[PDB]
Design a protein around this nucleic acid. Structure first.
Lengths: 100, 55, 68, 171, 96
RNA sequence: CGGAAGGGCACCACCAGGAGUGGAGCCUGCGGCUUAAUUUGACUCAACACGGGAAACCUCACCCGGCCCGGACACGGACAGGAUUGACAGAUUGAUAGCUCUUUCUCGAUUCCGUGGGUGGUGGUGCAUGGCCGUUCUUAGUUGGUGGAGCGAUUUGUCUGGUUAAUUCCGAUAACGAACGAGACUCUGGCAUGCUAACUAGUUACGCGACCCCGGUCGGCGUAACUUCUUAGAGGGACAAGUGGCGUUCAGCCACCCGAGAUUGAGCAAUAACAGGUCUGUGAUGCCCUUAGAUGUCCGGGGCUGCACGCGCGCUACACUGACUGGCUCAGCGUGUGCCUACCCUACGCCGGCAGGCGCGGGUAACCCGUUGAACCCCAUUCGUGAUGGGGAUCGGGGAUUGCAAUUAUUCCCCAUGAACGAGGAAUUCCCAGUAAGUGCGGGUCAUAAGCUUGCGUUGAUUAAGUCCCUGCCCUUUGUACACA
């Protein structure tokens, strides 16, 4: 009954639109909903030299990937979860649902 | 024979085991987060794998 | 380019015309004589023959040395 | 899952999966108007859609080539049988797709047309397609051994700042 | 080019049931990722389907590490003469 | 372009300074030398801890050697009475490479022998090129259409003046309408007890437990409210907005109140150009060269580190502001079990001084490391100006880890040896706010691995709010016998 849903997406507004969409979908069925827990993000720092050879001035890149994760807790069996999670999903968001 | 001297060198460690997955060179390899690809090929595909130069 | 040390030639493989004719000796009766041995190896029961070297017998491809 | 790698390695491996496919279809479907791919992640179903200009020319002999492209993903990436499927979809306003026009200019140069005359023929098509401006540069050696750089530019076209990442497309 | 006949008639059969098959560009590899059941050394098989191209029965494509062998319409009839298979059976990409 | 003039600007310039280098040791790269090879690219800014190049093999492109075709394909034979493959032995050898000499077994149209031919090349050519990067140029500059001028190259717009970091605007005006760039825009920082939310984050209360004399503490234990401390999302907030002055009173500028900010930092960045660098990044490549006794593949060893000398970036000291011995007490960026991949980060409990060795678990990661018990800092001894307990170069002996392999000491630990160096000449580098400087911690290269580099965090200032004096940059005028300027 204590089901965890993991919301990971690279885009900020692709994750933000689906994190509130599951709130709208679940509140129609009117069960116990926990709020979306905002946990600190992970950013991917890569710094490489711009010149393909070793000639010229020393300049460096700043290549980044910020990844965000949101956790929403549901107090429901898996029948309700399997219905809503198939509606309005976009490939930028990777959704992991844990029954336990 | 000839099979005993062709790939008898141990290549389970070091910089000779790893090479780029596009250029197959042994320099500038980004082993970080298991890209296993050189820095030079990292650039033209940086948008493709997904890094953005944000700051 | 030019080299000082002479090269190494290719090994001459001993091509034998009618090479199977020496394994058996034909007899006018209803029998066949096998001068060579029969290898007890698992991969080859009794058909594959073995080398008759100058020093001792040996079965070639199976890499199994036998001594008298 | 089996090896259960971290989420740091999960999104890194997805990017290389996208990047290797992007190198692949550029080298194989450029003659029939390849314009990009898009993955649709679903449980046990991996839908990847080939956004192509000429949808007629990519399906081939009764959809043989699309079925050929399915078997490539099955074997190189080790996906289970029936787990990944491919579709070809039409690209709206294909004149505004630079990678679709880059191979169009590439084949006009390769067909034997003049360097200049191939360049004008694309440019009045893309303003006919509704573009505010463009920049076309052909490098290399022209009319001799010495290298010359062409620059035949018209219209509104910016370079600097944030908007260049989504207001222009470069091939 | 003496990788023995036990290793041949499988890979044309392998190239028949799927018209295209993959291979990691790596000479020093005893096996295949796709064909992990048989020994089938990688370096000899690299010389197998390039000889298919050498008369012109197969195409070639590359993705950073990988030889891709798309069978041409000439290649089906070569497989019918070499393997003596009936003309009714078709590759999986020719069936829908 | 001017050692011509007038304006404006810059710590890759100065002023006033700070830390330094050059002075000593050591590390690293280059030149030179030498070697079989000490592979090579790069030589003012814009080469010299730069090719992410911290080379035992590989990397390696070099040398000494030794094997193989991985010469596909098309064509002439040779061929199943066999075209042709591997093989344990004796010497060969570096390897038990059938690689070769003797000597036979073995596979079976695949093959081998010649010609075209293709492949391979870290072979040459960046003064043939693609692509990428750097520099001109961090400056504010650059261009079209129409109209005007001149036969014309060209010019007006793109400006006399004011203002600005800005071709930033105001204002004039044979110029007008416009376009790139700057600005604008993206990320970060900072202020909101206002909104959303948290049992992988905590706070407050209840009830205990332990201790001390009702109260106090506990990373000791379970509960209900909350986001003040933890996180990230939507909004807000700052605009020269208000005031006093300067200014055509326009553009705008200075000061002050109020307010977390009355200039945070970085990204992006225009036209044209170098014959700048990269073919040794490529299954990017034109052309030239080799291709079977190969400039192709692979294996053993060496080398790229070699040392009369010079130079460049750096680390450690020359001490008492300190060295040593104890005790005390604080961080944030991050990262961590691999498609091939054979290799992760660590709690806790034992053995050994230590390097390290052995057991169990946790963590695919707000969960475990971790509350990251960091240096620095603070307190208390010894030393006593002594090349001294500064300093740790050189060097001897021993013990451990990774690796198939450490000798030319791979690294780590213990004892011992204890050099120069007493604040560094000519000359030269960087910087004005959490900045410099001091100091440690993450990531890269890593099997073994930071004197480098990339970020983070701690302690934390002196000086200056100006200038063209030098070095240079942007306009206007002027002159030229320069135009590869």
């Amino acid at each position: 009954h204590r089901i965890r849903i993991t919301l990971t997406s690279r885009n900020v507004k692709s994750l933000e639109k689906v994190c509130a969409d599951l709130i709208r979908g679940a509140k129609e069925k009117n069960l116990k909903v926990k709020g979306p827990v905002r946990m600190p993000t992970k950013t991917l720092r890569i710094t490489t030299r711009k010149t393909p050879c070793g000639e010229g001035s020393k300049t460096w890149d700043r290549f980044q990937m910020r990844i965000h994760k949101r956790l929403i807790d549901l107090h429901s069996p898996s029948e309700i979860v399997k219905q809503i999670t198939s509606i309005s999903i976009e490939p930028g968001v990777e959704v992991e649902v844990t029954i336990a | 024979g000839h099979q005993q001297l062709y790939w008898s060198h141990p290549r389970k460690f070091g910089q000779g085991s790893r090479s780029c997955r596009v250029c197959s060179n042994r320099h500038g390899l980004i082993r970080k987060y298991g890209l296993n690809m050189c820095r030079q090929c990292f650039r033209q595909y940086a948008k493709d794998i997904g890094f953005i130069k944000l700051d | 380019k030019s080299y000082t040390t002479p090269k190494k030639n290719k090994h001459k493989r001993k091509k034998v015309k009618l090479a199977v004719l020496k394994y058996y000796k034909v007899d006018e009766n209803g029998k066949i004589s096998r001068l060579r041995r029969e290898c007890p190896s698992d991969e080859c029961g009794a058909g594959v023959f073995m080398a008759s070297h100058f020093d001792r017998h040996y079965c070639g491809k199976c890499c199994l040395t036998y001594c008298f | 899952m089996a090896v259960q790698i971290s989420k740091k390695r999960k999104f890194v491996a997805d990017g290389i999966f996208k990047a290797e496919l992007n190198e692949f279809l550029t080298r194989e479907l450029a003659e029939d108007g390849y314009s990009g791919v898009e993955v649709r992640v679903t449980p046990t179903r991996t839908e990847i859609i080939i956004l192509a200009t000429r949808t007629q020319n990519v399906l081939g002999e009764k959809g043989r080539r699309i079925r050929e492209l399915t078997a490539v993903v099955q074997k190189r990436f080790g996906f289970p049988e029936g787990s990944v499927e491919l579709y070809a979809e039409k690209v709206a306003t294909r004149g505004l797709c630079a990678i679709a026009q880059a191979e169009s200019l590439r084949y006009k140069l390769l067909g034997g047309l003049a360097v200049r005359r191939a360049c004008y023929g694309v440019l009045r098509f893309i303003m006919e397609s509704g573009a505010k401006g463009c920049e076309v540069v052909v490098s290399g050696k022209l009319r001799g051994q010495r290298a010359k750089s062409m620059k035949f530019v018209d219209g509104l076209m910016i370079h600097s700042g944030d908007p260049v990442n989504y207001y222009v497309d470069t091939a | 080019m003496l990788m023995p006949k036990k290793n041949r008639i499988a890979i044309y059969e392998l190239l028949f049931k799927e018209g295209v098959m993959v291979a990691k560009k790596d000479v020093h590899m005893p096996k295949h990722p796709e064909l992990a059941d048989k020994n089938v050394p990688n370096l000899h098989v690299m010389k197998a389907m390039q000889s298919l191209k050498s008369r012109g029965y197969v195409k070639e494509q590359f993705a950073w590490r990988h030889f891709y062998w798309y069978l041409t319409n000439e290649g089906i009839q070569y497989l019918r003469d070499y393997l003596h298979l009936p003309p009714e059976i078709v590759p999986a990409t020719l069936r829908r």
